[PDB]
Write a protein that binds this ligand. Structure first.
Ligand SMILES: CCCCCCCCCCCCCCCCCC(=O)OC[C@H](COP(=O)([O-])OCC(O)COP(=O)([O-])OC[C@@H](COC(=O)CCCCCCCCCCCCCCCCC)OC(=O)CCCCCCCCCCCCCCCCC)OC(=O)CCCCCCCCCCCCCCCCC
Ligand SMILES: CCCCCCCCCCCCCCCCCC(=O)OC[C@H](COP(=O)([O-])OCC[N+](C)(C)C)OC(=O)CCCCCCCCCCCCCCCCC
Ligand SMILES: CCCCCCCCCCCCCCCCCC(=O)OC[C@H](COP(=O)(O)OCCN)OC(=O)CCCCCCCCCCCCCCCCC
Ligand SMILES: CCCCCCCCCCCCCCCCCC(=O)OC[C@H](COP(=O)(O)OCCN)OC(=O)CCCCCCCCCCCCCCCCC
Ligand SMILES: CCCCCCCCCCCCCCCCCC(=O)OC[C@H](COP(=O)(O)OCCN)OC(=O)CCCCCCCCCCCCCCCCC
Ligand SMILES: Nc1nc2c(ncn2[C@@H]2O[C@H](COP(=O)(O)OP(=O)(O)OP(=O)(O)O)[C@@H](O)[C@H]2O)c(=O)[nH]1
Lengths: 63, 98, 55, 26, 120, 139, 52, 64, 49, 32, 175, 320, 347
């Protein structure tokens, strides 16, 4: 076929690879960033739910 | 942390050493094993009683009834060893080797 | 001198000898728990304190 | 025909350990 | 790591909101390879039992392809879910953190001083 | 790692006696650990030869530790090049040669010369560049 | 847990006893009910890293 | 077949590291390699020196 | 014929095999409809149709 | 065919295997 | 004295543990262990754990260790290995009487004992909490919750015990 | 179905079927002593399953049509050949004995399998526990090299330990001059040349070894030729024991379920027979073994699993 | 042992491991470990040989000690925090305490000394259960508490696991001891990545599960326990030896076989975590496993070892086993590398 096919097709190949390349570099940075700060959706290590708290009055006022 | 807690913790550690530092009677080894849990049973009671973790008064029995279960296994293996070999020695309990 | 003696001894045979020399002594165990549990006691003792793993 | 293992090769792989010694001799 | 994200209901193989993604097309190349695995099990299945491999128990290996394809298909949707999920909250984060992602300056190669090493 | 910290605190090619003392302490402790293991897994039938076994192992490991202590430090002192990895390489080979002397075999000494000297260079390579073996969880 | 079946089907198996400020028999308190209740509600919906 | 065996396989099993074997191996080994390294290094250390200060001529040298 | 006894798989286990076709056609007809229902629901959810 | 022991071996130190090695090269010991 | 009474009970607990941990005769090791078993109950009793303290007497002193005596009566190595029989056991027993004597003195002088953990050598009585328990014994109400909230533990503990009896006869059946 | 674990769970036991006609009686004796004749009479008069003496092709009898396969394809040994040159360099002697031991060991399993699955007693000639009398005999004159004993024993403990001993053993006591009497009337030229020493050396090993050490775990009744022909006398003697010694009057359904597991798996029962200890008589090199295996494989029926060979007429291969 | 009794014993062992993975309370975690232990011994006792009794005794002593030592880690964490929830614990000594307590159950460090010997004594089927299913429970705790681990302490334990586990493997004749040494080596690979990212710690688990099911049930089908005994299997069933060499190569990690997928991803992760010396050394020691892997492959099918005339009976008969799930096991254990990006499903 014409060289136009290979030229345009390879341009798409470069476009796809570039976006993939920069995303991985972003992914390693974000993964490092949100692991440390922790204010992110994932890496949210488990805690204890506040629902399991007995708010009923106890037998001792000092509670 | 209160001085007594050392006494149980050190009791476990020296009980732990006796369990690992062997001799010639794995019967004696089992004694260190059940003594090992006795300190665990004893110490667990102190924190739970001290901190008034009322529902946690559970586990001293739960830990007991399961540590006691290992005695059933361990002592049963004792007589099994003391039947194919007759005795409870540990140096002779090396038939595996290779 | 080189192809059949030295070049086969420096890289290949030396590594093969070292692996075999230290494959035997790892596998040469006694089968007696007294020594194995003694090794564990060392491992617990050194790991807890000596290499500052706790702190 | 191509060489095939014989009792020499087999006994090389037979025993307690293919890398033996005096300690493992018995 | 998505181990504790907000909303993850446990023991949910395919969460409902994953349905908002393009489902894997029925002849997805990944899927047919999953079907390959089912077939490849079938040929050897007659081999261990010493049967006429290819022409031996057409029912047996036919089920293998069916089972592997479906278990593959649901796996692919779940696999596509996390990658979509991993990219989704990714993007939501960077807009929420502009200061940690500066826009690097736009300089053409003309002004960039890249030293040159001859090969001699 | 305070005992290991002693070696790092002393600047390279400076206060050679301190570096030798720090280095031989590392070797002595390392020899003690392996000797205690060898006593454990391999029974020292009689107690006295048990102290002989751990004596040999500690004496060796101290010798490699000590000899590497001087040769590394004095070479940096003599050549006024602390950053040079070769400083450890000669010391590494020097330590390996001492192992051959303790085992009385040129072949083992030659083998220890190459391997330990190469590793001695590599650890210095890491210290200069910043290589971390037990890296903390980063991502 | 590794597989939080308890959360999925909502049957309480052990978490009734995992902390001391939960429901207790005869509604009698632990030694540090006031403090751990404060810490628990401080560290809810926050994450282990941030709550540290 | 004895000759082929003695010249192909029966060398290393009969080999023993000795100063004669060791020195000859080193002499015929690293020796020539480092010797050529020094020769090529100094030659290249003179070549780039000449062109760097413009003391060499490659007016018609293009297809390098 | 050759083996003097009827070997266990020497006869077609009709109940078992007929099951195998039964599940596989179930396994398939579930898949196509599952693929179908996933498609337009995704289209409807994401706008489209 | 040559099975194993006509294949060459290690140096013959003492004259016993020197004689065996000489026979291995089908020659006498005075010239081996 | 009664100032540091729980200091005492903890001390015999340690020396009782050093007893059997020194690997003496299994009956003698049992004797040393039950001595620790006896004294340990007093430690729990001093904290109000009467029900827990009485149990170890029941199922650990009169429980496990009784059937231990059977295996000792079954083992019966050809000679008693009582403390005088061996010299390492004396060394083990003698040693185990030193460091705990060392650190109590270490803890009694400046109280800043930092073995593994930081530890205070202050009087045992301090860490007690002040407050009435009304009419409900806190220990009793805690254990009685076995059948109120400890439903899940009851099933698993029971099921394992049932599996406990199936294994024991199966291993001991000797095929 | 078989005795698979589902069967035992659903209720398939073993003690229900077996009755007083459940014994592992073995009729045995010296060469050509008419033991096989007496074994048949016991079988007929007791309604008790008979097993003829396991030959080289007994395994061939079990598999396929039962037609004896080629000696090259099954046995690599001939008893007639062993008669011609007992000390042949090819190892025909030990190869004969070891294959014979495997054949009777398979026969022992077939007897137990039928007995446990039917409750009917089994009578067989020369049980595997008595097989040593030949190897002992073949060792006394050097028909086999000394090392053959240890290998034959090594197989024996790793196999015969699990197979428990019979109930009552019938012995046809026959003296050597009598053995030297009939074998002329047999006529086959290979068995004329049997040495009187061999007939002697089986006899004492039979007498001083086989009968006494094995007697403590089953009843032993000795019959000479006259009490061998008296089928009426021997059969009521067999019925007139309590059969107390031996493991058989002690086990329960648990062991029998496990016992029928091992015996039903025809690969397992002789799995330890192919022991990897190498000796010249029994070891076959790779080239010879491979070529024979191809020759075995290209045979009809054996190309695939049973019920899976289209050549013999296995229809519906695509559906089985 | 009665099949109904055997089924129940396995049922509790599975549930005990299941109990560990589903408990948010530290006490229940211990309950699962002990009752799994409580039913593991009788399975090893099914054969009831003196070697098995030695094996079972060894297994119980180390596992009971590790489990009992595990209690203090819970108690000490309780003492300093008053939290029974299985989360990031709050004491370096307690964190250190349990790490070797769980490691002994897995057998990575010198703790690993029980792993080979117990496998040697007990039957092939029991070894399959011990080396595959009994490794999920200790791993489950480590995955949950991975955020609290000291990186130096765990990486070391992983290192000696692959280091010693691979090194001694060169000197094993019995296939059972070879498998255990392989298991210890594979133990290090998952444990090394454990502090960094737990996702491919699991990925290594199911994959490592696949070969060990594949290898052991192949070995059971072969009914062989020694290298020489395995060698003779070429004559009986040459095809099985062919698949085993595929798995042997795959378990060694040569691409594009499945066993390369874990190691490749493991190297990728710690490389992202700036740890680049650590992955390199494990890869170098990976060839150590490959050596005796090749030696078995050389003895099994690549060459053709001598057979015995008594093998001729085996030709006539056939196998009665059903080797359930064997067909799909090896296929899933040898060619799944193209389906690698499916690991995000684990996440
Ligand atoms: C991820 C991807 C990979 C994994 C995919 C998931 C599948 C993994 C397993 C594949 C199959 C493994 C197998 O069987 O190999 C053959 C191998 C050997 O089989 P064999 O040669 O027939 O010998 C087995 C016995 O020795 C024979 O002894 P027997 O003659 O007494 O027969 C007993 C047998 C026969 O079956 C029965 O008797 C049925 C039960 C009857 C009585 C009870 C009825 C009521 C309860 C029914 C419960 C079902 O029953 C059992 O063995 C009981 C266990 C199985 C049923 C219960 C399952 C748990 C509930 O199996 C075993 O050794 C069993 C080990 C235990 C199960 C597998 C454990 C390994 C895998 C763990 C990890 C799994 C993935 C985790 C993620
Ligand atoms: C099996 C028999 C025992 C379990 C079923 C019967 C008891 C149910 C029960 O106690 O449920 C407690 C709870 C439900 O609680 P509940 O509503 O029955 O009682 C609540 C009582 N207070 C308010 C004081 C807390 O359920 C469980 O614990 C279920 C555990 C699993 C059961 C099945 C295992 C398989
Ligand atoms: C991490 C610790 C790993 C411990 C492994 C212990 C078993 C394997 C090592 C062994 O048995 O010996 C190695 C070492 C030296 O042994 P050596 O005195 O040379 O004797 C060899 C011939 N019997 O003897 C040892 O005990 C040293 C082992 C740790 C070396 C660091
Ligand atoms: C920059 C700071 C540091 C500066 C100082 C330099 C480092 C410290 C000193 C050198 C340490 C490494 C050299 C080896 C020391 C141990 C030697 C030893 O154990 O020798 C005894 C023995 C060898 O002899 P053997 O095979 O037993 O034969 C005789 C048998 N009768 O041993 C054996 O048999 C077992 C095999 C050897 C022991 C195992 C390996 C030990 C070394 C591991 C690495 C240590 C690294 C230390 C430094 C970094 C960490 C602090
Ligand atoms: C990644 C790299 C490669 C990794 C794997 C490598 C594996 C082999 C490596 C070497 C192994 C050791 C040396 C060789 C061992 C041979 C083992 C063996 O048993 O060989 C003999 C045996 C005899 O064959 P037999 O079992 O009788 O079966 C014949 C077919 N019925 O032979 C056999 O049992 C083999 C039977 C093979 C049957 C093949 C059937 C193919 C069917 C193809 C169907 C194609 C359909 C295409 C459809 C297109 C349209 C969609
Ligand atoms: N090595 C060996 N040879 C056997 C065995 N059983 C039979 N033979 C041989 O088989 C040949 C003939 O079988 P015998 O049973 O001795 O004699 P027979 O003429 O068949 O008559 P019966 O003794 O009544 O069966 C003799 O050469 C025996 O030595 C056996 O278990 N091992």
């Amino acid at each position: 076929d014409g060289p136009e096919k290979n030229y345009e097709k390879t341009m798409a190949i470069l476009q796809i690879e570039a976006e993939k390349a920069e995303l991985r570099l972003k992914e390693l940075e974000v993964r490092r960033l949100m692991r440390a700060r922790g204010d992110g959706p994932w890496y949210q290590y488990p805690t204890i739910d506040k629902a399991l708290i007995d708010h009923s009055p106890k037998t001792t006022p000092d509670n | 942390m209160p001085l007594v807690y050392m006494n149980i913790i050190m009791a476990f550690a020296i009980a732990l050493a006796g369990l690992l530092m062997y001799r010639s009677h794995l019967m004696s080894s089992l004694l260190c094993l059940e003594g090992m849990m006795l300190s665990l049973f004893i110490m667990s009671t102190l924190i739970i009683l001290n901190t008034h973790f009322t529902l946690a008064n559970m586990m001293p029995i739960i830990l007991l009834v399961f540590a006691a279960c290992e005695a059933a296994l361990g002592l049963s293996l004792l007589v099994m060893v003391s039947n194919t070999y007759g005795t409870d020695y540990v140096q002779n309990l090396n038939l595996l080797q290779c | 001198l080189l192809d059949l003696i030295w070049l086969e001894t420096i890289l290949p045979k030396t590594t093969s000898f070292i692996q075999m020399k230290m494959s035997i002594m790892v596998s040469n165990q006694k089968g007696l728990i007294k020594l194995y549990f003694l090794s564990f006691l060392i491992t617990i003792m050194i790991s807890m304190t000596l290499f500052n793993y706790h702190e | 025909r191509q060489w095939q293992p014989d009792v020499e090769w087999a006994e090389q792989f037979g025993g307690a350990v293919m890398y033996p010694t005096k300690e493992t001799a018995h | 790591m998505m181990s504790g994200r907000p909303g993850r209901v446990p023991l949910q193989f395919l969460p409902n909101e994953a349905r908002s993604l393009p489902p894997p097309k029925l002849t997805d190349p990944r899927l047919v390879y999953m079907g390959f695995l089912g077939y490849c099990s079938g040929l050897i299945d007659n081999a261990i039992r010493r049967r006429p491999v290819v022409s031996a128990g057409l029912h047996r290996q036919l089920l293998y392809v069916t089972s592997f394809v479906f278990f593959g298909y649901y796996l692919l949707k779940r696999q596509d879910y996390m990658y979509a999920l991993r990219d989704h909250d990714m993007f939501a984060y960077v807009k929420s953190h502009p200061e940690d992602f500066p826009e690097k300056d736009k300089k053409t190669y003309g002004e960039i001083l890249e030293e040159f090493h001859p090969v001699r | 790692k305070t005992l290991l910290h002693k070696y790092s605190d002393i600047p390279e090619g400076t206060e050679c006696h301190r570096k030798a003392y720090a280095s031989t302490s590392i070797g002595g402790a390392t020899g003690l650990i392996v000797s205690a293991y060898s006593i454990a897994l391999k029974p020292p039938a009689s107690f006295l030869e048990g102290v002989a076994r751990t004596g040999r192992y500690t004496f060796t490991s101290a010798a490699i530790g000590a000899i590497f202590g001087l040769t590394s430090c004095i070479s940096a002192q003599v050549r006024e090049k602390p950053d040079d990895p070769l400083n450890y390489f000669i010391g590494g080979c020097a330590g390996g040669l001492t192992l051959g002397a303790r085992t009385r075999s040129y072949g083992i000494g030659a083998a220890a010369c190459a391997y330990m000297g190469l590793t001695a260079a590599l650890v210095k390579m890491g210290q200069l560049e910043g290589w971390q073996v037990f890296a903390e969880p980063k991502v | 847990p590794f597989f939080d079946v308890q959360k999925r089907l909502g049957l309480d198996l052990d978490r009734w006893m995992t902390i001391q400020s939960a429901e207790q028999p005869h509604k009698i308190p632990g030694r540090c009910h006031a403090f751990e209740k404060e810490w628990i509600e401080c560290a809810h919906g926050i994450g282990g890293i941030r709550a540290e | 077949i004895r000759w082929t065996y003695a010249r192909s396989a029966n060398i290393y099993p009969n080999f023993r590291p000795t100063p004669k074997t060791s020195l000859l191996g080193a002499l015929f080994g690293i020796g020539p390699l480092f010797f050529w390294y020094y020769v090529f290094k100094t030659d290249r250390d003179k070549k780039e020196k000449l062109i760097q200060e413009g003391k060499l001529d490659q007016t018609f040298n293009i297809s390098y | 014929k050759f083996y003097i006894r009827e070997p266990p798989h020497g006869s077609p286990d009709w109940l078992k095999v007929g099951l195998t076709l039964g599940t596989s056609v179930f396994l398939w007809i579930y898949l196509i409809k599952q693929h179908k229902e996933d498609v337009l629901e995704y289209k409807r959810r994401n706008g489209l149709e | 065919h040559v099975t194993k022991d006509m294949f060459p071996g290690p140096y013959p130190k003492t004259p016993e295997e020197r004689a065996a090695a000489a026979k291995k090269y089908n020659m006498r010991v005075e010239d081996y | 004295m009664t100032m540091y009474i729980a200091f005492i009970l903890s001390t015999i607990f340690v020396i009782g543990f050093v007893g059997f941990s020194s690997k003496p005769s299994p009956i003698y090791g049992g004797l040393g262990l039950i001595v620790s078993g006896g004294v340990g109950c007093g430690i729990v009793l001093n904290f109000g754990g009467s029900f827990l303290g009485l149990m170890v007497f029941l199922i650990y002193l009169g429980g496990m260790l009784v059937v231990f005596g059977y295996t000792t009566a079954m083992a019966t190595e050809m000679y008693p290995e009582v403390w005088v029989s061996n010299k390492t056991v004396f060394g083990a027993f003698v040693s185990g009487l030193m460091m705990e004597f060392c650190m109590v003195y270490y803890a009694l002088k400046e109280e800043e004992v930092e073995i593994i953990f930081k530890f205070n050598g202050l009087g045992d009585w301090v860490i007690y909490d002040t407050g009435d328990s009304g009419f409900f014994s806190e220990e009793a109400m805690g254990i009685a919750a076995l059948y109120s909230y400890g439903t899940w533990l009851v099933i698993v503990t029971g099921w394992s015990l049932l599996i406990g009896v199936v294994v024991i006869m199966e291993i001991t059946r000797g095929n | 179905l078989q005795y698979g674990p589902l069967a035992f769970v659903l209720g398939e036991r073993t003690t229900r079927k077996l009755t007083e006609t459940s014994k592992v009686i073995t009729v045995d004796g010296n060469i050509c002593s008419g033991k096989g004749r007496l074994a048949r009479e016991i079988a007929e008069k007791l309604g008790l399953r008979h097993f003829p003496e396991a030959g080289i092709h007994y395994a061939d009898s079990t598999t396929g049509d039962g037609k004896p396969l080629d000696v090259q394809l099954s046995g690599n040994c001939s008893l007639e050949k062993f008669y011609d040159d007992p000390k042949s360099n090819d190892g025909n002697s030990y190869r004969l004995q070891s294959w014979l031991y495997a054949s009777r060991l398979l026969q022992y399993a077939d007897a137990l399998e039928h007995l446990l699955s039917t409750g009917q007693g089994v009578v067989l000639e020369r049980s595997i526990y008595s097989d040593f009398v030949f190897l002992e005999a073949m060792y006394r004159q050097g028909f086999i090299r000394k090392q053959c004993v240890e290998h034959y024993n090594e197989v024996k403990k790793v196999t015969a330990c699990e197979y428990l001993p019979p109930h009552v053993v019938v012995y046809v006591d026959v003296p050597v001059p009598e053995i030297q009497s009939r074998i002329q009337k047999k006529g086959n030229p290979h068995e004329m040349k049997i040495t009187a020493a061999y007939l002697q050396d089986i006899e004492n090993a039979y007498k001083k070894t086989f009968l006494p050490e094995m007697s403590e775990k089953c009843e032993v009744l000795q019959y000479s030729a006259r009490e061998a022909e008296d089928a009426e006398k021997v059969v009521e003697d067999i019925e007139y024991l309590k059969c107390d010694k031996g493991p058989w009057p002690d086990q329960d359904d648990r062991t029998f379920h496990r016992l029928r597991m091992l015996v039903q798996n025809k690969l397992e029962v002789l799995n330890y027979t192919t022991i990897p200890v190498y000796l010249p008589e029994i070891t076959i090199g790779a080239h010879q073994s491979d070529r024979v295996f191809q020759k075995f494989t290209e045979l009809p029926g054996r190309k695939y699993s049973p019920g899976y060979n289209e050549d013999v007429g296995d229809k519906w291969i695509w559906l089985k | 042992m009665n099949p109904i009794i055997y089924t129940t014993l396995i049922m509790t062992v599975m549930s005990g491991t299941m109990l560990v993975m589903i408990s948010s309370h530290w006490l229940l975690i211990w309950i699962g470990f002990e009752m799994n232990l409580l039913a593991m011994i009788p399975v090893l006792m099914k054969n009831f040989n003196p070697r098995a009794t030695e094996a079972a005794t060894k297994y119980f002593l180390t596992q009971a000690t590790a489990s009992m030592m595990l209690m203090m880690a819970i108690i000490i964490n309780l003492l300093y925090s008053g939290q029974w929830t299985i989360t990031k614990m709050f004491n370096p000594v307690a964190m250190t305490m349990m790490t070797m307590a769980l490691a002994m159950k897995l057998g990575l460090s010198p703790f690993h000394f029980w792993v080979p010997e117990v496998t040697q004594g007990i039957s092939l089927q029991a070894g399959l259960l011990l080396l595959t299913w009994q490794k999920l429970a200790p791993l489950s705790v480590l995955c949950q508490i991975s955020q609290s681990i000291n990186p130096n302490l765990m990486l070391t334990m992983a290192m000696l696991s692959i280091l010693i586990g691979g090194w001694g493997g060169l000197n094993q004749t019995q296939l059972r001891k070879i498998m255990a040494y392989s298991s210890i080596a594979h133990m290090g690979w998952m444990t090394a990545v454990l502090p960094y990212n737990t996702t491919m710690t699991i990925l290594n688990l199911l994959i490592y599960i696949t070969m060990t099911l594949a290898m052991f049930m192949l070995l059971i089908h072969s009914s062989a326990t020694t290298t020489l005994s395995l060698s003779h299997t070429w004559n009986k069933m040459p095809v099985i030896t062919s698949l085993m060499m595929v798995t042997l190569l795959s378990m060694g990690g040569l691409p594009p076989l499945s066993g390369f997928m874990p190691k490749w991803m493991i190297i990728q992760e710690m490389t992202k975590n700036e740890s680049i010396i650590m992955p390199t050394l494990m890869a170098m020691t990976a060839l150590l496993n490959l050596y005796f892997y090749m030696r078995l492959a050389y003895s099994s099918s690549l060459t053709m070892f001598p057979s015995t005339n008594n093998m001729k009976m085996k030709w006539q008969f056939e196998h009665t086993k059903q080797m359930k799930l064997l067909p799909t096991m090896i296929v899933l254990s040898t060619l799944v590398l193209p389906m690698t990006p499916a690991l995000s499903s684990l996440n």
